Amino acid sequence: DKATIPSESPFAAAEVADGAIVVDIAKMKYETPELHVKVGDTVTWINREAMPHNVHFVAGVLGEAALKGPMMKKEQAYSLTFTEAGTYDYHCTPHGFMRGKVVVE
Ligand SMILES: [Cu+2]
Ligand code: NA
Ligand code: NA
C-alpha cells in the first residue's frame, strides 16, 4: 500500500495541531486541490461545512483496493499518511465533481 490510515473513523478537527498539513473542504471544493508533501507526511482533510464529504482514491491508486474514506460531518477530520512517492488523485464519493490530488515527493 502507498498510504496508512491513522484513524479509520473521522475525528475532531480540534485535535489537529496548528501547523499540521491540512486540506480544507468548503463550498463543495477541496480548497487545496494539488498538495505537495514529502514521503512520510500525514495529510488531514477537514470538513468545514455541513454537507458531508470524504476522500476517495479508486482501486489501484493507494493500493490493490480502493481507499474510500469515511464521510466527514462539519468540523470532522480524516488523515492519510503517504508512504511512497508519486501522485495520487482522489474525489468525493457522492460529489464526483470534487477532485483533488496529493503529490508525494
Ligand atoms: Cu463531497
Ligand atoms: Na486506492
Ligand atoms: Na485518519
Curated annotation (Swiss-Prot):
It is found in: Periplasm. Pathway: One-carbon metabolism; methylamine degradation. Binds 1 copper ion per subunit. Cu cation binds at H53, C92, H95, M98. Residues 1-105 form the Plastocyanin-like domain. One of its GO terms (molecular function) is copper ion binding. Its cofactor is Cu cation. This is Amicyanin. It comes from Paracoccus denitrificans. The gene is mauC. The chain holds residues 27 to 131 of 131 of the full protein.
